[PDB]
A paper describes a structure:
The genome is replicated via a negative-sense RNA intermediate by 3Dpol, the viral RNA-dependent RNA polymerase (RdRP). Crystal structures have been reported of 3Dpol of the enteroviruses CVB3, PV, EV71, HRV1B, HRV14, and HRV16, and of the aphthovirus FMDV. These enzymes adopt a classical right hand architecture, with fingers, palm and thumb subdomains providing the correct geometrical arrangement of substrate molecules and metal ions at the polymerase active site for catalysis.
Interestingly, the three virus pools each contained a single missense mutation compared to wild-type (wt) virus. These mutations were located either at nucleotide 7115 (A7115G) or 7127 (A7127G) resulting in amino acid changes M300V and I304V in the viral RdRP, 3Dpol, respectively. Markedly higher inhibition constants were observed for the two resistant mutants (M300V, 26.9 μM; I304V, 10.3 μM) as compared to that for the wt enzyme (1.3 μM). The apo structures of the EMCV M300V and I304V polymerase mutants were obtained using the same crystallization conditions as for the wt enzyme, yielding two different types of crystals for the mutants. The M300V mutant crystallized in the space group I4122 form with one 3Dpol molecule in the asymmetric unit (a.u.) and diffracted to 2.2 Å resolution. Structural comparisons showed that the mutant polymerases were almost identical to the wt enzyme. This could result in an increased flexibility of α10, including the disruption of the last helical turn, and of the B-loop, which appears to have a key role in GPC-N114 binding in EMCV 3Dpol.
Numbering used by the authors: 1 to 460
Write the structure that this text describes.
Amino acid sequence: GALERLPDGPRIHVPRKTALRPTVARQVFQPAFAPAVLSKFDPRTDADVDEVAFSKHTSNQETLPPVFRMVAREYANRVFALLGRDNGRLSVKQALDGLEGMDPMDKNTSPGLPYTTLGMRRTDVVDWETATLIPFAAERLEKMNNKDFSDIVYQTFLKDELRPIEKVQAAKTRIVDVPPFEHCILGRQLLGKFASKFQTQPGLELGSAIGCDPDVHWTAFGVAMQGFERVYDVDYSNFDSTHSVAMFRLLAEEFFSEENGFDPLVKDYLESLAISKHAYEEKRYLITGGLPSGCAATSVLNTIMNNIIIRAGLYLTYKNFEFDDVKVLSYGDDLLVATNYQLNFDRVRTSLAKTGYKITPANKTSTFPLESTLEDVVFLKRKFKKEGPLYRPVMNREALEAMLSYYRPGTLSEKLTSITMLAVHSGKQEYDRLFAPFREVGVIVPTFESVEYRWRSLFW
């Protein structure tokens, strides 16, 4: 129903071969993670990755009850009271360069279709100084400006990454959707002003942690949450399903509305995300519902949706629930609920499952605990460790060991450099244990003290 097979087109190349290679650490740590299945003939699975990858799109939740509209409206009122309603569209130059609260558009990333077929890059289709598109791209943009997204095709392929061993064996490989470059430019034009503002004020008050640096913001987040009796963690991750098409409609008319300062065309842009045409080799699918991965605004949209959904679930579960009975901190599929009340998220899970949404605990368990505090929760694979008046993001051990066990040739040193800044919060003994396999074989890795100094100095 939600996945319609269109007529075939030309073959867009899809990578069937991982770029990931094992490090010296793999044989020591032996993680229950490995490169995702990219090929029909992978011996590590019995399933067909092409069938399994798209199975989530075969069914989609048609409708949502009235409570979702009510929560979206109220969440919108709180956001735009904080962020203001100056959310008009940016110019193409402004979109390319970016505003104070956001980076410029990456010129090295894929231009999308049909440019990848013709062997072109983003720098070929636009001049970055003048902000001038080539005749073909200018016509495409003007077409979209007339509310017509008819010939926008997302370049779709399998995501080359580490997955849990269970997902490898079931061929549960994630999908990447790359939109055309002019679709990305339009998207940043329409939502970039809001986004830059949204990503620069992460915290409990906004309800979002998007755009945070965990090194600094863990203290702010932690300090705001420590006064609450309880903090629960919620995971939205679900390979088998995607966002309802109805959710896009709610955001279009309750959140990203003209009354909240957005351009008239946003409704149509959001529709091009909700119902999208995707190219996967020769095959062409029309997919109803779901968020494309490669859209710059994806993680922001997912964060907002999931914030709305958890309160909707609470209203659906508890007749006497009120908006301010909890505080929410959302980041993509990860969510914290801070409250003084005792809440039963097993019951909330049952309520949300009636609307096609799955929630699980953020940790290993299969059931939600009745009691949960700040010290118990996991958020972006990190716990909250108190350090005087500060909080530090202590990353899960299995996560660190998995990251250290594989790499991409060429970028090893900068991967290890990033991991030192994650591993520092686990203490010197653990830090040295994690990097021991590398410097036993002669690799120089920054000392614990050098990286600990850097973090400490952030608050002096």
